[PDB]
Amino acid sequence: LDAVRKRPGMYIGDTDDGTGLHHMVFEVVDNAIDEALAGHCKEIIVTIHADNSVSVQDDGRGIPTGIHPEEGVSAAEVIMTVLGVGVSVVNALSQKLELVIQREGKIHRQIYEHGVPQAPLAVTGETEKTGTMVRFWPSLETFTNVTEFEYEILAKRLRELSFLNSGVSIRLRDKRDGKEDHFHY
Amino acid sequence: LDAVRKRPGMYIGDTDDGTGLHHMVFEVVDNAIDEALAGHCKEIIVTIHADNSVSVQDDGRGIPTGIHPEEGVSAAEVIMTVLGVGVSVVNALSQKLELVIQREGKIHRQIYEHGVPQAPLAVTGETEKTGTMVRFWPSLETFTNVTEFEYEILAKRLRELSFLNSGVSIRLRDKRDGKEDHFHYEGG
């Protein structure tokens, strides 16, 4: 991931004018859409939190949790840490990232800081539901000037995606001012 | 460097009791002694700064600055970013690291933060002198509990090192209180 950390702008886009900041959300949403497509309910929830983080949930199968035979770590960790530009870019440029996977009757959790896992992916409980959730806090060392998520930039792109991905429900929620939308074709 | 960032304790040692913290200085000092040994004058200066950073400088040839054919970056950057334990561990576990190389009449400067170079190695000026200087700020995200450099730990070790490295002048300076030492054994 140091190649991404060296030149963030080349992977995510301009880190000063707000282009890169919002692309972080869109990269995560692309992965959530693929997961939503192969599930049953087919819904995604993008939430802007009051502390300037964004969470993207899907209700799909849950991304794979088993150990990757080559890398020797969880398959999820390989997705989050190894080089669509990839969510590993988003992880590398996030001062914190929380991963939650609901799969095969179990809830799995992992925390990253600047792309570095704080511990191995771990089973934290039981559940009937399935899906994946990523909440990330953009690194304020990387992202300058425009540091706050504008609602309408996200709403605009998610609207475009809802037409292209006709089977998927996309909800957008802003916890700062209570604004919300529901894009579905 | 992510392998070091994943488990800092495995590379630098205990990051709570202060032993790992001081190992950061001694790893850089071992590289400075290697560079000093290649010259004739051979002086090293270790300085504890008032902001709890430590600088280590030598007056040797200066570490290589040319672009590495495979890696596509300066040889200096390769040394600082590719995995004693190596300086790349020190760089990875420093919230800031400043590199200054004087070589072939040119001053070269580069800044790192948490192992990540902020720009490519750059010729910023001219010089009659040669040598390498590394100044690092230990990462407070990694190093907990004991976060300040004890003068006595460094002074004791540098004194021991002086007797193994003949002709190498080792100066220790503490800018917090003005305390300084000069270890120079000229045996053989």
Ligand SMILES: CC(=O)c1ccc(O)c(O)c1
């Ligand atoms: C990282 C990843 O693969 C991913 C998949 C689904 C998600 O809902 C998400 O937020 C991230």
Ligand SMILES: CC(=O)c1ccc(O)c(O)c1
């Ligand atoms: C890391 C390295 O090669 C190095 C060489 C000389 C030095 O004086 C120093 O502080 C570091």
Ligand SMILES: Nc1nc2ccccc2[nH]1
């Ligand atoms: N603050 C901060 N920035 C970092 C960049 C890479 C790895 C760890 C880091 N901690």
